[PDB]
Write a protein that binds this ligand. Sequence first.
Ligand SMILES: [Zn+2]
Length: 257
Amino acid sequence: HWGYGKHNGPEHWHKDFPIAKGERQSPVDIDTHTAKYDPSLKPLSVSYDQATSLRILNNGHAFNVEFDDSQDKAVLKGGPLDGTYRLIQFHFHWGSLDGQGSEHTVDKKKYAAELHLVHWNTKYGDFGKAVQQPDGLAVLGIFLKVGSAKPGLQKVVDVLDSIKTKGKSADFTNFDPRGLLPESLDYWTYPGSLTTPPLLECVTWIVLKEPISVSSEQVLKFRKLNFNGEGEPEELMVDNWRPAQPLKNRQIKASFK
Ligand SMILES: [Zn+2]
């Protein structure tokens, strides 16, 4: 099955998912000299006040916090978007050391981790239908750097010991994803793809310029997770990031210079 290792990782994915070599693959390196400041780009609107988290799960590739997307309120809109998108889940990618782990890079710089908040377009009925459309998803990508602790992340870090292996999950109600956002919503944006198989080219990417700071203690907890199931040989969940893919003449636009 696909994964992140030497024999099933990103260099192999094209054999089962030929779109891996397509025209709008993600992530990408954000070259700040070639990105284009667009003064017409509006502020992002992130409205998480009524977000209803349900559960946290280790799916064997990352851990996901799932949300009740049956109603509005928990919505991403504005910015480069022409529709409204409902939050369905978030997850992270991270490294085997603080010096790598992000999927997007900025002038080739890698962050320790990257948070993906995944939202689907309300034109399309549900997530599964939305991913079949070029504008089906809007993913808010947020870099993590190591520094002070992020208080809003602590509940997440604290629960990870209970979901160590693939197929484990825990109750995870009453979590407020507003605690994962940086102060500034300045962003880069470009059209791209899921960064995991099936790699569908259905995403408007919105990557925040400002990282959030998390502590070394917090990020170390990510690295205790396992790719394997319970009872199987230990395979530590680290380096679950796809490297940057060719931009292929897409334009990355910025809400700032
Ligand atoms: Zn992701």
